[PDB]
Amino acid sequence: MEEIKGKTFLPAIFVGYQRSRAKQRENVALVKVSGIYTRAETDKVLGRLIAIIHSKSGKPIFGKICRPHGNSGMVRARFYTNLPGQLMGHKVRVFYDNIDVGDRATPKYERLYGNPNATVTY
Amino acid sequence: MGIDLKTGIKKRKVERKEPKSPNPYIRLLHNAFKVVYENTGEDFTKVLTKRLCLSKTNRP
Amino acid sequence: KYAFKSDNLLVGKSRRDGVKASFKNTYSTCRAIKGMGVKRAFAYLDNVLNHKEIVPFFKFYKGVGRHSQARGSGTDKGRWPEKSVVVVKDILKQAVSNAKHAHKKEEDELYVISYCVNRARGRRRRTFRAHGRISKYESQPCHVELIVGPKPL
Amino acid sequence: SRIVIDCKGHILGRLSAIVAKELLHGHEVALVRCEKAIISGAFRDVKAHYLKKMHKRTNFNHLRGPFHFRAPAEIVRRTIRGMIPYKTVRGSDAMSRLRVYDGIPPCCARYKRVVCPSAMAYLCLRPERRRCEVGRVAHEIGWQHAADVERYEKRRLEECDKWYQDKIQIDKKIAEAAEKDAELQRINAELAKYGY
Amino acid sequence: LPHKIIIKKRKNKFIRFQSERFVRVKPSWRKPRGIDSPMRHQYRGQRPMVSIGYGSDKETRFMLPCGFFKHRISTVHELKTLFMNNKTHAAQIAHGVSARSRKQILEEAKKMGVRVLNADAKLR
RNA sequence: GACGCCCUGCGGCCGCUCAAAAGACCUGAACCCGGCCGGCCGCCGGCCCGCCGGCCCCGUCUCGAAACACGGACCGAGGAGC
RNA sequence: GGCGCGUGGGCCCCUCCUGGUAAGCAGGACGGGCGAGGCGGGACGAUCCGGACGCCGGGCCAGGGUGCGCCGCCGGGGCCC
RNA sequence: CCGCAGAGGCCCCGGGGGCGAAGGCGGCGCGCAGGCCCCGCCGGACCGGCCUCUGGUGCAGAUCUCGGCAGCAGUAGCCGC
Ligand SMILES: [K+]
Ligand SMILES: [K+]
Ligand SMILES: [Mg+2]
Ligand SMILES: [Mg+2]
Ligand SMILES: [Mg+2]
Ligand SMILES: [Mg+2]
Ligand SMILES: [Mg+2]
Ligand SMILES: [Mg+2]
Ligand SMILES: [Mg+2]
Ligand SMILES: [Mg+2]
Ligand SMILES: [Mg+2]
Ligand SMILES: [Mg+2]
Ligand SMILES: [Mg+2]
Ligand SMILES: [Mg+2]
Ligand SMILES: [Mg+2]
Ligand SMILES: [Mg+2]
Ligand SMILES: [Mg+2]
Ligand SMILES: [Mg+2]
Ligand SMILES: [Mg+2]
Ligand SMILES: [Mg+2]
Ligand SMILES: [Mg+2]
Ligand SMILES: [Mg+2]
Ligand code: NA
Ligand code: NA
Ligand code: NA
Ligand code: NA
Ligand code: NA
Ligand code: NA
Ligand code: NA
Numbered sequence A: 001m002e003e004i005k006g007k008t009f010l011p012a013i014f015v016g017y018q019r020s021r022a023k024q025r026e027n028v029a030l031v032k033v034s035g036i037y038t039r040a041e042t043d044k045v046l047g048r049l050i051a052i053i054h055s056k057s058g059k060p061i062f063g064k065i066c067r068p069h070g071n072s073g074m075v076r077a078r079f080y081t082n083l084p085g086q087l088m089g090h091k092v093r094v095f096y097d098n099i100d101v102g103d104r105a106t107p108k109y110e111r112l113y114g115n116p117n118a119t120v121t122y
Numbered sequence B: 001m002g003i004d005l006k007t008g009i010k011k012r013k014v015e016r017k018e019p020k021s022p023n024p025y026i027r028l029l030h031n032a033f034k035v036v037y038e039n040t041g042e043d044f045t046k047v048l049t050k051r052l053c054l055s056k057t058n059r060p
Numbered sequence C: 001k002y003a004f005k006s007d008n009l010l011v012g013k014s015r016r017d018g019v020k021a022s023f024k025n026t027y028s029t030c031r032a033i034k035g036m037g038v039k040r041a042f043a044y045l046d047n048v049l050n051h052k053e054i055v056p057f058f059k060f061y062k063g064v065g066r067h068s069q070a071r072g073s074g075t076d077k078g079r080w081p082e083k084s085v086v087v088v089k090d091i092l093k094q095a096v097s098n099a100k101h102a103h104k105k106e107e108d109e110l111y112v113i114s115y116c117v118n119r120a121r122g123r124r125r126r127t128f129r130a131h132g133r134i135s136k137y138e139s140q141p142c143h144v145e146l147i148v149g150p151k152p153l
Numbered sequence D: 001s002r003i004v005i006d007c008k009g010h011i012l013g014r015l016s017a018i019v020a021k022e023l024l025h026g027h028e029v030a031l032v033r034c035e036k037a038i039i040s041g042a043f044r045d046v047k048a049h050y051l052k053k054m055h056k057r058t059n060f061n062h063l064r065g066p067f068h069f070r071a072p073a074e075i076v077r078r079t080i081r082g083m084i085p086y087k088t089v090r091g092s093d094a095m096s097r098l099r100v101y102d103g104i105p106p107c108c109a110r111y112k113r114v115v116c117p118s119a120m121a122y123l124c125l126r127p128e129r130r131r132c133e134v135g136r137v138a139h140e141i142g143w144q145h146a147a148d149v150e151r152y153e154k155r156r157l158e159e160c161d162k163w164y165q166d167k168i169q170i171d172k173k174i175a176e177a178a179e180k181d182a183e184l185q186r187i188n189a190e191l192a193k194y195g196y
Numbered sequence E: 001l002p003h004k005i006i007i008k009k010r011k012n013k014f015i016r017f018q019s020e021r022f023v024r025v026k027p028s029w030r031k032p033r034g035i036d037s038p039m040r041h042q043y044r045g046q047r048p049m050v051s052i053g054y055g056s057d058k059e060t061r062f063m064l065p066c067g068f069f070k071h072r073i074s075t076v077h078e079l080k081t082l083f084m085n086n087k088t089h090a091a092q093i094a095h096g097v098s099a100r101s102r103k104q105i106l107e108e109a110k111k112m113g114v115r116v117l118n119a120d121a122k123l124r
Numbered sequence F: 001g002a003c004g005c006c007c008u009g010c011g012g013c014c015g016c017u018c019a020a021a022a023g024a025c026c027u028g029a030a031c032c033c034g035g036c037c038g039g040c041c042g043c044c045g046g047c048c049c050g051c052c053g054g055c056c057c058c059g060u061c062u063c064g065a066a067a068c069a070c071g072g073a074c075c076g077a078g079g080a081g082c
Numbered sequence G: 001g002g003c004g005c006g007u008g009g010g011c012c013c014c015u016c017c018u019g020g021u022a023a024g025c026a027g028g029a030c031g032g033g034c035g036a037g038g039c040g041g042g043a044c045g046a047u048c049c050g051g052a053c054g055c056c057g058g059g060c061c062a063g064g065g066u067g068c069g070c071c072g073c074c075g076g077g078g079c080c081c
Numbered sequence H: 001c002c003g004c005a006g007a008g009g010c011c012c013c014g015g016g017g018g019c020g021a022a023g024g025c026g027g028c029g030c031g032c033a034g035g036c037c038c039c040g041c042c043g044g045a046c047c048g049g050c051c052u053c054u055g056g057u058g059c060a061g062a063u064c065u066c067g068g069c070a071g072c073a074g075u076a077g078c079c080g081c
Helices: A039-043 A108-112 B024-038 B043-052 C023-033 C038-049 C082-103 D012-024 D043-053 D072-081 D089-097 D134-141 D146-180 D183-192 E076-080 E099-112
Strands: A009-019 A024-033 A049-053 A060-069 A074-079 A091-095 C012-019 C111-119 C126-129 C133-136 C142-149 D002-006 D028-032 D038-040 D098-100 D131-133 E069-073 E089-093
Touching (some): B024 B043, C023 C038, C023 C082, C038 C111, C082 C142, D002 D012, D072 D098, D072 D134, D089 D098, E076 E099
Antiparallel strands (some): A009 A024, A049 A060, A049 A091, C012 C142, C126 C133, D038 D131
8 A cells, every 4th residue: 555655646436337227337437536527627637547445455456547428527447457346436546646557557458468469488 | 240132142052063972083083183274274174174073963 | 973073082972873753852952952061961951851941942943832931042932852851861871971981081071062963764654534545654763963072162 | 524515495306316416426415404495386286295195005004105204304315215226235325324404403513514506496496486495394294393493493593693703703813813924825825826 | 389378258158048946957058949938039138158259269279278289198109109299289198097107108208308287196 | 793891771882803894785876954164145247255237937839928828846767750 | 953841820010991980890902020130219018219140359329318316418599387 | 060879990019907997076177069188085897099880879848657855844633432
């Protein structure tokens, strides 16, 4: 937890998955950011690092903001691993500073299948 | 998906391409003449290979 | 044939097979006696023999009635089975004797640490019904085993 | 932190919608003075609607629901429950984060209250539209504590009025001290460059 | 030998319809064939259906996670013959070979530089 | 199926023969059940695992079956184009 | 050209008809559908509105909608039990 | 094409086996799948990969047949003389 110790941030909330009234897509999470009320203002925060804290382990899980959602300032985010349903309604951090987590924030599909024709060596 | 392919098009046709006989002599001859036709495009050889593929009821 | 095994190696044991007593009543009696000191267990069984204490039923209780002697035990049902009590007293006495003589232990530190009751094959009789029909009239015996040892913990 | 809303002059349905959305996002909200919420429409129509609602009960056993509450706070709570998935764990935890009161009891008299202007009657209804307070309807359908609520609110209001002057003087002194202090001046000047 | 990364289009097995509700129905796959069958129609909530399309890339089909191809043997002669392409093929000793034969086979394989997948078996 | 020790007797323990109790007997599955030890409701999917989303009971005759249409408590073995 | 199977109880929509007071009634006609067509919508439906299907990642968007349940909204003109 | 039982052959000094075969239980791996393989425990004498040949050759249903067995339930009941 000390990797993010004393780093100021803009608060946010995780309000659920991308969905319709028939299907659910847990690859994507919808996040509401404080002080953002319009699609353009969201355009001001695109591609920034975020984190959420697992109520058990205590370790932070990192992700990135991808694109807007709707007209009223919601955004879509992807995490290092997909989130359980128990976290719905918790707080996420949008850090003001710049951190270097390496690849701690890249989704699993991109990590494992960046290029389909990669080679394994020995 | 989502395409129309049954408006001005007919069903495929089935034709013989191999002799169908267990006799190894006929297989050898058919393959040799097929090679010759591949390398020259002559009509005599094409008709010969087709004839060598025919069934016994079609070879009086 | 013993379902109990461990490294305690200071336990007395006894068993009987094909006991001609109801399996459900015997199960209840053995479950009731578990975790007691041997002296208290003997006193309790003798008290049940003359309706001073009761055997609470936790498993086979559909027709068992409510009685005031069962107050404060976790259930309001119980009965006073006598055949089961006699059989269980015999087996417990044998186990205590086996423990005392083999390991020279005294009777003031022995507890009832384990038990197991299993269903057995019974004798078949027949009964007659209306309109010339015949039904079965079988019994429900059991196998019993009791273990006495130093203390649960 | 808990959000405490003063429901005087608010429209019941619009306030319920806002509060339900807030509850589902993980906030704790408390509603005070629920007897002053407003329902649009003539008192006769509102009363007839509520009497009709009270007429539905299980024919073979009235103890099996539905239940019809008469106090304004429970009326408001039921209206909010209508806008929430209360049969699931997610919605069942949301309804446990909500508190509703008639008047302002001691457990909430020390909080900072807010309003929602988008759900207030003086901005939502035309001047000539009829309206009524949930307190009058509740009294007409069986609520027993209207007069007691009024008495307690009067007493508390006078006591609060006594407290305002001390706050006035203390605030004046704090303002003068803050103006005098030098460290705050630097912060204010720094913020003024951003328009804050 | 280096190779492409192995992808498995599906990780779980294809279970037969309704085999969780009856002991008499085994989980091995059968094609559903009823007139009213809901898994034949493939409504939204049902389990997936077998089809060509789940097939593995044929560059890495039958490849073990270690990156080798399996070859089952039972004699020392079987090992010596047909193991000149030791680059891609590993040996697996059959179940019924005894401990003495296993000793001899392991010595020969170690001499020939051939990998043995179940080398630790029957070693107590 | 030695000996020894308990037991008012019924029986029990400990051990003995044997490679092995294989102890009235080869192996010893399923259904059903008792003890101890861990959990809290079925299937599919995502996940740091109990949260979210989806899911009417099959076979059959039938224009049309979840049907208040029929057969089916459960398990094993047998069972119908030669 | 040869050999051969199943089928020979059908029903619904659009528009056009006949008997009947009428009927989710009975009988006919061009085209389409269900039967034998997954998926989204029409709260809910074999047939309606879109779209006809190998297993996946990304983008665009039909039909239908955008207070809260429940993914998604604003601006302008008129009327208003 | 997968699997079952049997027949005719092969299995480089002549296929595997009490240094443990068939079968049973639990767990990995491989295959779109039917299935196959390996490991651990039990068991105690047989077993089969490939080519050709043969068939009384694959079960959820039939108010199916034979055997075993559950809930109901410590229930109904143990009223003539
Ligand atoms: K019918
Ligand atoms: K009937
Ligand atoms: Mg009789
Ligand atoms: Mg008679
Ligand atoms: Mg697979
Ligand atoms: Mg799951
Ligand atoms: Mg669900
Ligand atoms: Mg039939
Ligand atoms: Mg008929
Ligand atoms: Mg009919
Ligand atoms: Mg049906
Ligand atoms: Mg069979
Ligand atoms: Mg007919
Ligand atoms: Mg009709
Ligand atoms: Mg039909
Ligand atoms: Mg069609
Ligand atoms: Mg929404
Ligand atoms: Mg022998
Ligand atoms: Mg035969
Ligand atoms: Mg069967
Ligand atoms: Mg009863
Ligand atoms: Mg009775
Ligand atoms: Na034998
Ligand atoms: Na249906
Ligand atoms: Na019938
Ligand atoms: Na029946
Ligand atoms: Na549909
Ligand atoms: Na085996
Ligand atoms: Na047969």
